[PDB]
Amino acid sequence: QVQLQESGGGLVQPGGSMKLSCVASGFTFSNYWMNWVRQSPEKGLEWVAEIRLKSNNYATHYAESVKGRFTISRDDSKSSVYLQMNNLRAEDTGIYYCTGVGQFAYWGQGTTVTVSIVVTQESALTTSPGETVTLTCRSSTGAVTTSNYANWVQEKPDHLFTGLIGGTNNRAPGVPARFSGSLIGDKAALTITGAQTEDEAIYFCALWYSNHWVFGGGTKLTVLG
Template sequence: MRLVVTQPFSVAESLGTTVKLSCALSSGYSISSDRVRWIQQKPGSAPRFVYHYYTSSDQGRGTGIPERFTVSPDTSNNLWNLVISGVQAEDEADYYCFTWDGKCCWGRGIPSESVSLGGTVTLSCSLSSGAMINQSHPQWIQQRTGKVPRRLVYGTSHRAAGVPERFTAAMSGNTMSLTIAGALAEDEADYYCVAWSEGAQHSATRGGGTETKSS
């Protein structure tokens, strides 16, 4: 059974009003047993962790997120709502929901890497403390301009569907790396590393990501 998460394409509201952004699970899955996370993406900025929700006693905002952001579960329709009360102009953004059995932190990457077409480039990021292990569920996310973030690799050996074999991942100590062998023009994008940590239950840090440029 495949898990599918459904969101509305676009929602428009007047400033100062309340908006609800829904995130529904497919049949066979229940919001009562899954944890949702919301990510905010503004043009030209790195993804920002907004909120996680599991139960009424296990929920929390990301660092610096205003109290006007909350999550409300709707068990009858098997969905969560991200509720923004008193919408402000700065709240205009893309919002992505996802579910996972863990807690999320965005890693810190170097600002930019350049590689010639056909060349090989390795991107890396590190945890501020502790070792990177499989239980951290390390992942790499690719963000092309104007596109939805795409998961590339999780762990060290699992590529997401449709990801070419030229993308490989590795871990060593507190560092995770992504290697692109035989880079193509289509690989030019921002890349973000993600890892889960029990200590990040109620907050998360996010890195600026790493931009790759082909030449």
């Protein structure tokens, strides 16, 4: 059990500031880039920010939605990543997760912040135990390639995220072998070969475009029978 654990969220007014923290354990924190990703009341995931390694002088990149207002930082000696949020807006409301490793294997449980390119996935698919089901992930820019480093992430109740696949087809360790990533017909795809009842979940894909991630809107997989 690698563990990530976020803290610092709460109930804040527009205009305010707040700093989130996240403490990592179980992996060599300092060898990996770290990210913040947030889930809004709309259920969707939005990549917020990344921070690289000491050897990259800690280079950072931000979503356009938060550039100029948020600052990500890390303290390798404390295995911790941070997000300073300034000039908060109603649209900043959501659950904030710290996540990383090949490229989204690990997620914290998240910390709730309440302020008061299109990647397309199937809205829903229905399967049953023992079937083979394939979920797809399309880019508005054109064909998905290995240069998009497609990741697949599973959301179980309640806001429990685990990375399944990174780098198009690389299974995260401990991930069941029934899960596989591919490119099929210029889309990324995730296949469950022999669906199990416990695979009923929301599945998100994420595609990399040079220096940022864009998450798809997710696919609700129902496993019936």
